[PDB]
Amino acid sequence: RPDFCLEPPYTGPCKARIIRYFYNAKAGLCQTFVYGGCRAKRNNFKSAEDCMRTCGGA
Amino acid sequence: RPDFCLEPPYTGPCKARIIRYFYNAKAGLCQTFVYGGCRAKRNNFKSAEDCMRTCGGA
Amino acid sequence: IVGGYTCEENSLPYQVSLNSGSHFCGGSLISEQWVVSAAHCYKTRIQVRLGEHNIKVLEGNEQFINAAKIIRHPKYNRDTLDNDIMLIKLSSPAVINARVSTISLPTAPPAAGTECLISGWGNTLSFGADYPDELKCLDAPVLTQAECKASYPGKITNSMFCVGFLEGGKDSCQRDAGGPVVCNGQLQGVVSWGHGCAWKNRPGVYTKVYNYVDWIKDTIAANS
Amino acid sequence: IVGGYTCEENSLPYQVSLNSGSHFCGGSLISEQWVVSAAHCYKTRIQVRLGEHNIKVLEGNEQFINAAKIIRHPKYNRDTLDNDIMLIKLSSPAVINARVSTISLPTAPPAAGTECLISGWGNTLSFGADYPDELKCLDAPVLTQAECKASYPGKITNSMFCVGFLEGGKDSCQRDAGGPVVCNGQLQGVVSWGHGCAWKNRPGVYTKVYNYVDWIKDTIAANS
């Protein structure tokens, strides 16, 4: 139910390619995205499990 | 359960006085702090039930 | 304000406060109907208060006026803080008297070495918290752009200058934002940001009002 | 790398990749035992691959060597990206041959306008995603400190410089981080960050390696 779960995935400005999970509310589940390795927003997880625990349902 | 819930609260550089909520790991619940109006860290919520619903028992 | 002093009651009539259930920022009255503050002090609904000294204990003469239009600078950057300036239009014109009065806009940029007066109801502790009821004041010099940029490498933009003391001890603080920095009868600055409050080599950073002199004109024109 | 070209298979022996589950960063081989990367490429376990051109299609030249020490700059700021540099000591020294070989550290800073070679297996699209299997190269000049500042007001510290094109269309991208910017045979830059990839007036920002020559010597000596 938290609003940060509805934000777009945030790669950020760094140039790494790090697989992270975000909740996609229009899908109703967690998806993979590329994180750059700095300045993570809150819709950004190490597992889908981590992701659902926090954002699932949203 | 997220590990950013373990960070102390972060007022930041800006000079507003804005009440926000952070998870106090040692107390086991959410408390208030003064937010300056910019550069929020992740342990920064707009209310208690908000905070406790994502960091409650972190 | 850290390391400052209590202002004289009848001496900062241009000083205002911004309110949303509580005092959150300051501001400056520049005309009977417009206030200058900081962009980071934006809220959707704002109540301005004028003629205050003690924000708790009313001496009879305070005005409470809802803001009608609240207008952040368009090139305001919430991350870098470039262009940290905002204009508020009062729903009624302020009554101008001994205790509410406008501050002149600036005619030239900030000049290093000049003594300014910074004021507000900000925290008076560098550490922990004492939000004061009485308006505080600090006399402090404009610093050189070099001193400003060395204290904060890469962070100083065209819209910013530092006022204060590199020794620390004396500075503006939380709840001070949006408030005035007056040098020689003109609003040179708006309280913006800093690293901590009154830390050594970390002076306050302020928005140059002078940069926005045409934007302030044009904004009032367009909306009045 | 956006708007670049496939590297000669023979020509960048100093180019390494850092791997965990998958390829996540690049690096530069700077002695038989040590690799320079970005501090934002730090992980607790890394295996360095050496001698790659196509990261999916092995030509037989490749070495797979674990990092035994992974050492971020002690002043790396996770939020401003200041001092974004890291050293890795390999568990065994690399076998030196035509495909695995070192690059010179810098002996001076690079002059604005010098032509550099940037390389990596980073995204080749500015939007969406094409992660290439083949190593890509970009010819790009060092930009002035003024151009760099104008592009990124508030964000460029003393450890940072820009290489690229203010018109956009050519830049480094995700998965390029930690990799080399080579200017006349010397490693002048480490791919760090940017606003998008190949956006107008937003060139890549790189760490100034020349600024760490001492630290790298010390660290390499402290860690024999």
Side-chain angles (χ1 to χ4, degrees):
Chain A
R1 278 161 277 118
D3 291 357
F4 67 78
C5 295
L6 306 157
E7 288 290 3
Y10 187 65
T11 290
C14 293
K15 283 180 171 169
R17 182 197 197 203
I18 293 176
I19 197 187
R20 289 286 168 99
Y21 296 82
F22 78 105
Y23 183 75
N24 186 344
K26 258 198 189 179
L29 65 214
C30 293
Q31 311 187 321
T32 66
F33 82 103
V34 174
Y35 175 54
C38 75
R39 311 264 293 143
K41 299 196 176 176
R42 290 181 293 186
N43 199 7
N44 174 334
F45 303 91
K46 262 88 153 230
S47 55
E49 304 103 281
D50 254 32
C51 181
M52 286 305 284
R53 202 151 41 233
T54 297
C55 281
Chain B
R1 293 154 113 66
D3 71 343
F4 72 62
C5 294
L6 299 204
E7 305 297 339
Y10 184 66
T11 295
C14 289
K15 281 170 172 174
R17 193 193 192 196
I18 301 163
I19 194 169
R20 284 298 171 77
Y21 299 85
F22 82 104
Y23 187 73
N24 190 140
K26 216 168 168 189
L29 64 219
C30 291
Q31 299 193 316
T32 67
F33 80 110
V34 176
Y35 175 53
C38 71
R39 307 231 187 120
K41 297 203 165 315
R42 289 165 289 173
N43 196 6
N44 179 326
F45 302 82
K46 308 227 174 142
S47 66
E49 331 72 53
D50 286 11
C51 172
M52 263 320 277
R53 254 197 265 118
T54 281
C55 291
Chain C
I1 301 280
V2 178
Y5 63 95
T6 298
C7 310
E8 181 188 47
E9 304 217 9
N10 223 58
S11 54
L12 300 221
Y14 54 89
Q15 172 84 238
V16 308
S17 78
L18 308 192
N19 297 91
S20 208
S22 57
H23 292 72
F24 71 96
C25 270
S28 297
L29 186 67
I30 57 171
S31 51
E32 288 154 65
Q33 208 135 42
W34 291 83
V35 163
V36 174
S37 188
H40 77 261
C41 292
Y42 187 77
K43 293 181 168 303
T44 300
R45 308 286 211 257
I46 294 180
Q47 182 202 55
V48 185
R49 290 185 187 182
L50 313 95
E52 306 157 296
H53 179 258
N54 193 312
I55 55 163
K56 237 241 192 250
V57 181
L58 310 178
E59 335 200 58
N61 31 53
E62 294 81 13
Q63 311 176 29
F64 310 78
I65 308 166
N66 302 312
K69 309 140 175 270
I70 307 156
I71 302 164
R72 277 179 288 191
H73 204 276
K75 299 176 141 175
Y76 176 57
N77 195 126
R78 355 162 182 276
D79 181 36
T80 75
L81 313 175
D82 195 6
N83 298 305
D84 196 10
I85 187 159
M86 174 175 80
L87 278 162
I88 284 143
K89 192 179 182 204
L90 299 183
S91 64
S92 42
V95 162
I96 304 298
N97 53 47
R99 284 187 294 299
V100 175
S101 124
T102 74
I103 184 66
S104 303
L105 288 161
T107 65
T114 312
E115 285 264 324
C116 300
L117 190 85
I118 317 180
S119 58
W121 285 281
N123 196 4
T124 60
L125 292 178
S126 325
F127 181 84
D130 192 292
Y131 294 87
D133 292 325
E134 280 179 300
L135 181 71
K136 296 301 182 278
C137 280
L138 174 75
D139 294 305
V142 180
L143 306 173
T144 79
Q145 264 317 136
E147 294 175 290
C148 193
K149 298 176 136 162
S151 295
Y152 298 115
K155 294 196 167 199
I156 308 313
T157 77
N158 188 48
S159 77
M160 306 171 186
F161 72 119
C162 293
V163 192
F165 302 84
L166 301 178
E167 270 186 327
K170 290 169 181 169
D171 200 352
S172 61
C173 216
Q174 280 68 44
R175 203 166 72 173
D176 283 322
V181 184
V182 175
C183 322
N184 289 124
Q186 305 192 329
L187 185 72
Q188 286 291 340
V190 180
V191 180
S192 200
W193 66 277
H195 191 121
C197 310
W199 284 25
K200 192 210 147 295
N201 239 295
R202 306 292 176 262
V205 190
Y206 304 83
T207 304
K208 301 171 187 183
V209 174
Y210 178 72
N211 294 21
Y212 305 96
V213 136
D214 291 340
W215 179 71
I216 286 161
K217 263 162 217 164
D218 293 355
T219 285
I220 299 184
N223 270 285
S224 280
Chain D
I1 305 283
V2 176
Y5 61 93
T6 305
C7 293
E8 291 177 20
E9 189 175 308
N10 296 249
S11 315
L12 301 315
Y14 54 83
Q15 172 84 236
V16 310
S17 67
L18 326 191
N19 300 257
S20 195
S22 69
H23 297 73
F24 72 90
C25 270
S28 306
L29 189 73
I30 62 147
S31 81
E32 279 148 298
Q33 210 143 202
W34 294 81
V35 158
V36 182
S37 192
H40 81 259
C41 295
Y42 178 90
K43 289 192 162 197
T44 275
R45 209 86 34 119
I46 295 168
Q47 183 168 74
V48 180
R49 307 179 177 195
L50 303 98
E52 294 161 308
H53 173 256
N54 196 311
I55 62 169
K56 290 209 226 234
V57 168
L58 305 191
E59 300 113 40
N61 305 312
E62 305 76 9
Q63 293 173 52
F64 308 70
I65 309 165
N66 287 319
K69 277 114 186 71
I70 308 165
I71 298 160
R72 282 166 296 197
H73 195 273
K75 289 193 189 105
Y76 170 65
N77 186 138
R78 133 171 312 294
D79 286 313
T80 70
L81 309 177
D82 198 17
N83 304 303
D84 190 12
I85 188 155
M86 179 173 76
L87 279 167
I88 291 174
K89 189 194 199 184
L90 306 162
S91 59
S92 23
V95 179
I96 295 302
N97 53 36
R99 305 293 234 86
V100 184
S101 203
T102 61
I103 189 70
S104 181
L105 289 192
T107 69
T114 299
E115 220 72 22
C116 299
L117 188 68
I118 318 201
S119 57
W121 295 274
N123 198 352
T124 69
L125 319 176
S126 315
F127 182 85
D130 191 86
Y131 290 82
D133 296 325
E134 306 203 89
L135 183 64
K136 304 292 162 146
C137 281
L138 182 76
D139 295 318
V142 181
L143 300 174
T144 62
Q145 280 333 293
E147 283 161 333
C148 199
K149 247 124 274 241
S151 297
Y152 293 103
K155 299 271 222 95
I156 309 299
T157 66
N158 177 247
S159 73
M160 301 175 196
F161 72 124
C162 296
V163 190
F165 306 81
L166 309 173
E167 69 184 322
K170 310 207 259 181
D171 200 353
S172 52
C173 205
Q174 277 68 42
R175 207 167 66 167
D176 288 321
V181 174
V182 168
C183 310
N184 300 144
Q186 319 199 324
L187 185 66
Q188 289 286 7
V190 171
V191 183
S192 190
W193 63 276
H195 281 7
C197 311
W199 290 18
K200 222 180 85 158
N201 294 318
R202 300 292 183 275
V205 189
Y206 298 86
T207 311
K208 297 186 207 180
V209 173
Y210 171 75
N211 291 14
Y212 305 87
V213 148
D214 284 341
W215 177 73
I216 297 182
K217 270 206 169 191
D218 297 348
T219 286
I220 291 176
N223 278 283
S224 297

mmCIF file of all heavy atoms in Angstrom, chain D residues 6-7 20 22-23 28-30 45 59-60 68 90 108 114 118 120 123 126-127 137 148 164 176 183 221:
data_model
loop_
_atom_site.group_PDB
_atom_site.id
_atom_site.type_symbol
_atom_site.label_atom_id
_atom_site.label_comp_id
_atom_site.label_asym_id
_atom_site.label_seq_id
_atom_site.Cartn_x
_atom_site.Cartn_y
_atom_site.Cartn_z
ATOM 1 N N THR D 6 32.593 -1.441 -32.552
ATOM 2 C CA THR D 6 33.293 -2.613 -32.011
ATOM 3 C C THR D 6 34.801 -2.417 -32.041
ATOM 4 O O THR D 6 35.391 -2.075 -33.096
ATOM 5 C CB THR D 6 32.898 -3.951 -32.731
ATOM 6 O OG1 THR D 6 31.474 -4.124 -32.681
ATOM 7 C CG2 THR D 6 33.546 -5.188 -32.043
ATOM 8 N N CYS D 7 35.418 -2.633 -30.864
ATOM 9 C CA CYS D 7 36.879 -2.542 -30.687
ATOM 10 C C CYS D 7 37.628 -3.525 -31.570
ATOM 11 O O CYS D 7 37.091 -4.596 -31.828
ATOM 12 C CB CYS D 7 37.241 -2.850 -29.213
ATOM 13 S SG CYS D 7 36.619 -1.536 -28.059
ATOM 14 N N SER D 20 29.857 -11.163 -10.892
ATOM 15 C CA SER D 20 29.334 -11.855 -9.718
ATOM 16 C C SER D 20 28.415 -12.945 -10.296
ATOM 17 O O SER D 20 28.895 -13.950 -10.887
ATOM 18 C CB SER D 20 28.653 -10.853 -8.754
ATOM 19 O OG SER D 20 28.434 -11.423 -7.441
ATOM 20 N N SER D 22 26.738 -12.171 -12.914
ATOM 21 C CA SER D 22 26.823 -11.761 -14.323
ATOM 22 C C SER D 22 27.820 -10.626 -14.445
ATOM 23 O O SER D 22 28.410 -10.212 -13.423
ATOM 24 C CB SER D 22 25.467 -11.310 -14.822
ATOM 25 O OG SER D 22 25.088 -10.088 -14.204
ATOM 26 N N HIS D 23 28.064 -10.173 -15.673
ATOM 27 C CA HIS D 23 28.912 -8.976 -15.914
ATOM 28 C C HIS D 23 28.199 -7.672 -15.410
ATOM 29 O O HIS D 23 27.076 -7.324 -15.823
ATOM 30 C CB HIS D 23 29.266 -8.799 -17.418
ATOM 31 C CG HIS D 23 30.071 -9.909 -17.992
ATOM 32 N ND1 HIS D 23 29.544 -11.157 -18.268
ATOM 33 C CD2 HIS D 23 31.372 -9.963 -18.365
ATOM 34 C CE1 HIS D 23 30.485 -11.928 -18.775
ATOM 35 N NE2 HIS D 23 31.602 -11.226 -18.856
ATOM 36 N N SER D 28 40.356 -1.755 -15.452
ATOM 37 C CA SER D 28 41.600 -1.624 -16.205
ATOM 38 C C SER D 28 42.713 -2.304 -15.438
ATOM 39 O O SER D 28 42.912 -2.014 -14.239
ATOM 40 C CB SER D 28 41.965 -0.170 -16.461
ATOM 41 O OG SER D 28 40.902 0.492 -17.084
ATOM 42 N N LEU D 29 43.430 -3.183 -16.150
ATOM 43 C CA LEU D 29 44.625 -3.866 -15.598
ATOM 44 C C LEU D 29 45.825 -2.920 -15.608
ATOM 45 O O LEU D 29 46.268 -2.474 -16.675
ATOM 46 C CB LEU D 29 44.942 -5.149 -16.371
ATOM 47 C CG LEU D 29 46.033 -6.006 -15.710
ATOM 48 C CD1 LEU D 29 45.501 -6.733 -14.399
ATOM 49 C CD2 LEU D 29 46.599 -6.961 -16.707
ATOM 50 N N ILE D 30 46.312 -2.570 -14.409
ATOM 51 C CA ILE D 30 47.344 -1.521 -14.254
ATOM 52 C C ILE D 30 48.685 -2.039 -13.714
ATOM 53 O O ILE D 30 49.671 -1.315 -13.728
ATOM 54 C CB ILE D 30 46.870 -0.334 -13.336
ATOM 55 C CG1 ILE D 30 46.553 -0.791 -11.904
ATOM 56 C CG2 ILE D 30 45.722 0.410 -13.957
ATOM 57 C CD1 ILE D 30 46.878 0.317 -10.842
ATOM 58 N N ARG D 45 32.259 -10.123 -3.179
ATOM 59 C CA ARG D 45 32.942 -11.139 -3.992
ATOM 60 C C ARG D 45 32.900 -10.729 -5.443
ATOM 61 O O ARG D 45 31.838 -10.461 -5.965
ATOM 62 C CB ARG D 45 32.165 -12.453 -3.932
ATOM 63 C CG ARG D 45 33.028 -13.670 -4.093
ATOM 64 C CD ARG D 45 33.602 -14.075 -2.705
ATOM 65 N NE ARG D 45 32.660 -13.803 -1.597
ATOM 66 C CZ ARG D 45 32.155 -14.723 -0.769
ATOM 67 N NH1 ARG D 45 32.503 -16.012 -0.895
ATOM 68 N NH2 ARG D 45 31.308 -14.341 0.199
ATOM 69 N N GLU D 59 37.316 -17.275 -27.180
ATOM 70 C CA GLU D 59 38.288 -17.440 -28.264
ATOM 71 C C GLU D 59 39.485 -18.258 -27.775
ATOM 72 O O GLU D 59 40.364 -18.622 -28.549
ATOM 73 C CB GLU D 59 38.758 -16.071 -28.816
ATOM 74 C CG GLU D 59 37.645 -15.167 -29.403
ATOM 75 C CD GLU D 59 37.370 -13.833 -28.576
ATOM 76 O OE1 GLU D 59 38.366 -13.200 -28.093
ATOM 77 O OE2 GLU D 59 36.160 -13.444 -28.415
ATOM 78 N N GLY D 60 39.506 -18.528 -26.474
ATOM 79 C CA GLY D 60 40.574 -19.279 -25.824
ATOM 80 C C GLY D 60 41.638 -18.471 -25.071
ATOM 81 O O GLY D 60 42.531 -19.027 -24.429
ATOM 82 N N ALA D 68 40.990 -10.811 -4.422
ATOM 83 C CA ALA D 68 41.431 -11.265 -3.109
ATOM 84 C C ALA D 68 41.470 -10.110 -2.134
ATOM 85 O O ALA D 68 41.497 -10.307 -0.904
ATOM 86 C CB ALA D 68 42.806 -11.998 -3.208
ATOM 87 N N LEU D 90 44.288 -9.095 -7.643
ATOM 88 C CA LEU D 90 43.909 -10.427 -8.109
ATOM 89 C C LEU D 90 44.566 -11.473 -7.216
ATOM 90 O O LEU D 90 45.606 -11.234 -6.625
ATOM 91 C CB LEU D 90 44.342 -10.619 -9.586
ATOM 92 C CG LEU D 90 43.821 -9.520 -10.534
ATOM 93 C CD1 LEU D 90 44.561 -9.434 -11.846
ATOM 94 C CD2 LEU D 90 42.380 -9.788 -10.784
ATOM 95 N N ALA D 108 50.524 12.944 -15.930
ATOM 96 C CA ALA D 108 49.997 14.308 -15.930
ATOM 97 C C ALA D 108 48.463 14.286 -16.106
ATOM 98 O O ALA D 108 47.903 13.277 -16.468
ATOM 99 C CB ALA D 108 50.700 15.180 -17.083
ATOM 100 N N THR D 114 42.180 16.807 -25.736
ATOM 101 C CA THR D 114 42.878 15.574 -26.004
ATOM 102 C C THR D 114 41.873 14.511 -26.382
ATOM 103 O O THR D 114 40.761 14.474 -25.840
ATOM 104 C CB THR D 114 43.612 15.093 -24.795
ATOM 105 O OG1 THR D 114 44.563 16.095 -24.449
ATOM 106 C CG2 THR D 114 44.323 13.728 -25.064
ATOM 107 N N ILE D 118 37.389 5.371 -24.838
ATOM 108 C CA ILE D 118 36.486 4.821 -23.797
ATOM 109 C C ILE D 118 35.986 3.479 -24.257
ATOM 110 O O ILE D 118 35.639 3.299 -25.450
ATOM 111 C CB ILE D 118 35.266 5.824 -23.544
ATOM 112 C CG1 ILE D 118 35.810 7.270 -23.517
ATOM 113 C CG2 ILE D 118 34.427 5.420 -22.256
ATOM 114 C CD1 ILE D 118 34.971 8.292 -22.827
ATOM 115 N N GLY D 120 33.997 -0.558 -23.213
ATOM 116 C CA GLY D 120 33.065 -1.239 -22.375
ATOM 117 C C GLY D 120 32.029 -2.090 -23.095
ATOM 118 O O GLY D 120 31.758 -1.932 -24.286
ATOM 119 N N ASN D 123 25.451 -0.666 -22.179
ATOM 120 C CA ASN D 123 24.287 -0.472 -23.065
ATOM 121 C C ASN D 123 24.665 0.344 -24.302
ATOM 122 O O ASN D 123 25.415 1.330 -24.215
ATOM 123 C CB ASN D 123 23.200 0.213 -22.250
ATOM 124 C CG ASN D 123 21.798 0.100 -22.855
ATOM 125 O OD1 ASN D 123 21.594 -0.360 -23.981
ATOM 126 N ND2 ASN D 123 20.827 0.608 -22.110
ATOM 127 N N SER D 126 20.536 4.567 -25.814
ATOM 128 C CA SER D 126 20.210 5.689 -24.891
ATOM 129 C C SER D 126 18.851 5.434 -24.130
ATOM 130 O O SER D 126 18.621 5.890 -22.961
ATOM 131 C CB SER D 126 20.117 7.065 -25.673
ATOM 132 O OG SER D 126 21.177 7.355 -26.637
ATOM 133 N N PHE D 127 17.955 4.727 -24.831
ATOM 134 C CA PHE D 127 16.639 4.333 -24.313
ATOM 135 C C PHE D 127 16.334 2.791 -24.460
ATOM 136 O O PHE D 127 16.455 2.196 -25.549
ATOM 137 C CB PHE D 127 15.491 5.206 -24.927
ATOM 138 C CG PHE D 127 14.125 4.854 -24.367
ATOM 139 C CD1 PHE D 127 13.689 5.424 -23.168
ATOM 140 C CD2 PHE D 127 13.326 3.872 -24.987
ATOM 141 C CE1 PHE D 127 12.450 5.042 -22.607
ATOM 142 C CE2 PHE D 127 12.089 3.482 -24.442
ATOM 143 C CZ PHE D 127 11.640 4.069 -23.251
ATOM 144 N N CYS D 137 33.991 0.640 -28.355
ATOM 145 C CA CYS D 137 34.950 1.705 -28.194
ATOM 146 C C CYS D 137 34.268 2.955 -28.664
ATOM 147 O O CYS D 137 33.354 2.905 -29.502
ATOM 148 C CB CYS D 137 36.227 1.491 -29.040
ATOM 149 S SG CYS D 137 37.435 0.320 -28.387
ATOM 150 N N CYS D 148 32.038 21.125 -18.305
ATOM 151 C CA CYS D 148 31.624 20.081 -17.376
ATOM 152 C C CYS D 148 30.693 20.658 -16.329
ATOM 153 O O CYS D 148 29.699 20.030 -15.939
ATOM 154 C CB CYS D 148 32.867 19.409 -16.735
ATOM 155 S SG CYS D 148 32.565 17.749 -15.980
ATOM 156 N N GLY D 164 33.537 13.672 -23.820
ATOM 157 C CA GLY D 164 32.447 13.377 -24.733
ATOM 158 C C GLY D 164 31.991 14.504 -25.617
ATOM 159 O O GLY D 164 32.798 15.298 -26.094
ATOM 160 N N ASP D 176 29.191 -0.057 -18.352
ATOM 161 C CA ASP D 176 30.486 0.519 -18.644
ATOM 162 C C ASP D 176 31.282 0.971 -17.385
ATOM 163 O O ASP D 176 32.515 1.155 -17.464
ATOM 164 C CB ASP D 176 30.409 1.715 -19.604
ATOM 165 C CG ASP D 176 30.070 1.315 -21.052
ATOM 166 O OD1 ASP D 176 30.568 0.276 -21.521
ATOM 167 O OD2 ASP D 176 29.351 2.082 -21.746
ATOM 168 N N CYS D 183 43.958 8.061 -22.799
ATOM 169 C CA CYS D 183 44.364 9.260 -23.526
ATOM 170 C C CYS D 183 45.856 9.185 -23.768
ATOM 171 O O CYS D 183 46.672 9.371 -22.849
ATOM 172 C CB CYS D 183 44.055 10.506 -22.693
ATOM 173 S SG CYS D 183 42.320 10.542 -22.046
ATOM 174 N N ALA D 221 51.533 -0.953 -2.171
ATOM 175 C CA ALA D 221 52.684 -1.257 -1.319
ATOM 176 C C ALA D 221 52.215 -1.774 0.082
ATOM 177 O O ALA D 221 52.848 -2.682 0.660
ATOM 178 C CB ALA D 221 53.577 -0.023 -1.220
#
